[PDB]
Design an enzyme around this catalytic site. Structure first.
Site, PDB file in Angstrom:
ATOM      1  N   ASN A  10       0.951  -1.182  -0.052  1.00 47.99           N
ATOM      2  CA  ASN A  10       0.101  -0.074   0.063  1.00 47.99           C
ATOM      3  C   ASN A  10       0.908   1.329  -0.011  1.00 47.99           C
ATOM      4  O   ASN A  10       1.182   1.767   1.044  1.00 47.99           O
ATOM      5  CB  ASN A  10      -0.733  -0.150   1.106  1.00 47.99           C
ATOM      6  CG  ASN A  10      -1.972   1.116   1.126  1.00 47.99           C
ATOM      7  OD1 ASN A  10      -1.920   1.955   0.304  1.00 47.99           O
ATOM      8  ND2 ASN A  10      -2.812   1.341   2.274  1.00 47.99           N
ATOM      9  N   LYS A  12       0.096   4.101  -0.499  1.00 45.24           N
ATOM     10  CA  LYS A  12      -0.592   5.326   0.086  1.00 45.24           C
ATOM     11  C   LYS A  12      -0.324   6.664  -0.680  1.00 45.24           C
ATOM     12  O   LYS A  12      -0.146   6.400  -2.071  1.00 45.24           O
ATOM     13  CB  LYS A  12      -0.400   5.545   1.796  1.00 45.24           C
ATOM     14  CG  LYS A  12      -0.761   4.207   2.472  1.00 45.24           C
ATOM     15  CD  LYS A  12      -0.418   4.813   3.747  1.00 45.24           C
ATOM     16  CE  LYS A  12      -0.773   3.415   4.775  1.00 45.24           C
ATOM     17  NZ  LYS A  12      -0.863   3.518   6.189  1.00 45.24           N
ATOM     18  N   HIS A  94      -9.786   1.181   4.053  1.00 46.97           N
ATOM     19  CA  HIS A  94      -8.500   1.114   4.994  1.00 46.97           C
ATOM     20  C   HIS A  94      -8.841   2.132   6.037  1.00 46.97           C
ATOM     21  O   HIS A  94      -9.617   3.065   6.032  1.00 46.97           O
ATOM     22  CB  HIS A  94      -7.337   1.942   3.855  1.00 46.97           C
ATOM     23  CG  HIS A  94      -6.123   1.715   4.655  1.00 46.97           C
ATOM     24  ND1 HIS A  94      -5.808   2.818   5.588  1.00 46.97           N
ATOM     25  CD2 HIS A  94      -5.125   0.826   4.365  1.00 46.97           C
ATOM     26  CE1 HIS A  94      -4.402   2.257   5.975  1.00 46.97           C
ATOM     27  NE2 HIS A  94      -4.225   1.369   5.435  1.00 46.97           N
ATOM     28  N   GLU A  96      -7.349   4.717   7.202  1.00 46.22           N
ATOM     29  CA  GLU A  96      -7.303   5.997   7.149  1.00 46.22           C
ATOM     30  C   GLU A  96      -8.552   6.638   6.500  1.00 46.22           C
ATOM     31  O   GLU A  96      -9.121   7.721   6.738  1.00 46.22           O
ATOM     32  CB  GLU A  96      -6.041   6.404   6.319  1.00 46.22           C
ATOM     33  CG  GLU A  96      -4.862   6.073   6.973  1.00 46.22           C
ATOM     34  CD  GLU A  96      -3.690   5.663   6.230  1.00 46.22           C
ATOM     35  OE1 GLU A  96      -3.611   5.828   4.836  1.00 46.22           O
ATOM     36  OE2 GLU A  96      -2.600   5.081   6.647  1.00 46.22           O
ATOM     37  N   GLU A 166      -5.960  -5.205  10.183  1.00 43.81           N
ATOM     38  CA  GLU A 166      -5.029  -4.104  10.351  1.00 43.81           C
ATOM     39  C   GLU A 166      -5.498  -3.260  11.690  1.00 43.81           C
ATOM     40  O   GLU A 166      -6.250  -2.395  11.663  1.00 43.81           O
ATOM     41  CB  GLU A 166      -4.746  -2.925   9.306  1.00 43.81           C
ATOM     42  CG  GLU A 166      -4.498  -3.452   8.092  1.00 43.81           C
ATOM     43  CD  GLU A 166      -3.889  -2.635   7.184  1.00 43.81           C
ATOM     44  OE1 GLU A 166      -4.563  -1.763   6.896  1.00 43.81           O
ATOM     45  OE2 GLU A 166      -2.651  -2.824   6.739  1.00 43.81           O
ATOM     46  N   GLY A 172       1.808   2.529  11.072  1.00 42.14           N
ATOM     47  CA  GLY A 172       2.582   3.655  11.056  1.00 42.14           C
ATOM     48  C   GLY A 172       3.070   4.085  12.453  1.00 42.14           C
ATOM     49  O   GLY A 172       4.126   4.893  12.387  1.00 42.14           O
TER      50      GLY A 172
END
Lengths: 249, 249
Positions: A10, A12, A94, A96, A166, A172
């Site tokens: 990913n 991003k 996801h 985010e 996840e 992160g």
């Protein structure tokens, strides 16, 4: 036997034409001697160059998001546009997007269903927050997320779905789950799928782990019985992504 | 004398490689015999093909949205990525993004400022809802939106900004503003800019009208003293977009 593993990059919202070209050249040069589906999810802008330049046959390219239909949605990209463009894999829901961009369980579920109906392979993301983990509510939260997706699918549709588990607090942050935590989360997801949907579906389902996966911790995670590969953020922009591919056996 | 006009095609979330190629071929074949900046804002996926295929020098290509910075923003595209990709125009704060995708006055303002700082030409969108128009609050609403943008810019930055005034209730509805309504809205915006920022800035500022512009109504709108061109949605996917270009004189 485990189903076919997946190693998904990913990227991003990242990359220059130069820096992604250099990484793609590395991937093209990499010897991969077992069956693993590699996935590169680039920003929309980079799909054209990634399709043209990635030529390693164990790799497919993916989008990082879409909306279901074309129309008056300035700034957004739809599933028919991606399908017309030859992109057949997609990451949806996801963390985010759930956190920043208004995607509820039901919005994610509807995007997953439209994408499966369109013919996509879908990496659908689920995972609990730090508060939820602290409160011991990981199972109910992630099973609620997956139940929402399942509600909009037929049993036959699961052949097109991959789950990425996840934990939000692992993304992160450099806080990777221990192999035992990852294994129990994947096991509980699989047990739910077996019980609510079907045992056959449960055994074939890829459940990938994501959240601070790197070249050093990947192999130990992959040795867990219910882990089928990885969705990789920061490390997927680095050469050590190839060590994560090597870890899927 | 009016500043240079703009005819901007907002393709929104639309198009196949085939259908956009056919339109681009039409644009490439079109004789444009006056000074007008034409803009094509394609989905992110289509930027590569539009850059390669559009070759008419009066056209530039634009993105329909961005976020300010690269990083862990799955699904999104940043200004540095677009800049690296050679895209130097952008539409920001479109009504659909303000309505559907959480963009407040301040979020729009921050995106505009980052884009100007990055070197972009920016078409920043403002406009009131049906309720606001009914309540006679058009001026306060649109001036509040523009004041938010202005708060984050320096005077010199305005050389890089274009305002698109698009009443929400006119978008996609077939309800175009009358030339007098468009003229008064543009005039009030320009007067505010003259008074709060500078007379020189006010005279040079392009204020474009959008909301059900078509080949038939464009020329009459353009004859208004404070109208400097158009942001075009549905009609920009059709041959009659060239008649809108012809209307900018």
């Amino acid at each position: 036997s485990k189903p076919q593993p997946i190693a998904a990059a990913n990227w991003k919202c990242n990359g220059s034409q130069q820096s992604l070209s250099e990484l793609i050249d590395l991937f093209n040069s990499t010897s991969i001697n077992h069956d693993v589906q590699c996935v590169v999810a680039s920003t929309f802008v980079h799909l054209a160059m990634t399709k043209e330049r990635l030529s390693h046959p164990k790799f497919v390219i993916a989008a990082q998001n879409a909306i279901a239909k074309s129309g008056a949605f300035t700034g957004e990209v739809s599933l028919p546009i991606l399908k017309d463009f030859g992109v057949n894999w997609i990451v949806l829901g996801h963390s985010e997007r759930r956190a920043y961009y208004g995607e509820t369980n039901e919005i994610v579920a509807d995007k997953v269903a439209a994408a499966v109906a369109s013919g996509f392979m879908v990496i659908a993301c689920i995972g609990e927050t730090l508060q939820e983990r602290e409160s011991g509510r990981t199972a109910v939260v992630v099973l609620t997320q997956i139940a929402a997706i399942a509600k909009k699918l037929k049993k036959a549709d699961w052949a097109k779905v991959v789950i990425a588990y996840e934990p939000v607090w692992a993304i992160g942050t450099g806080k990777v789950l221990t192999p035992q935590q990852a294994q129990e989360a994947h096991a509980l997801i699989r047990s739910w799928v077996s019980s609510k949907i079907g045992a056959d579906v449960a055994g074939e389902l890829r459940i990938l782990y994501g959240g601070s996966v790197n070249g050093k911790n990947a192999r130990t995670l992959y040795q867990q019985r219910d882990v089928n590969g990885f969705l990789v953020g920061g490390a997927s922009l680095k050469p050590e992504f190839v060590d994560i591919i090597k870890a899927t056996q």
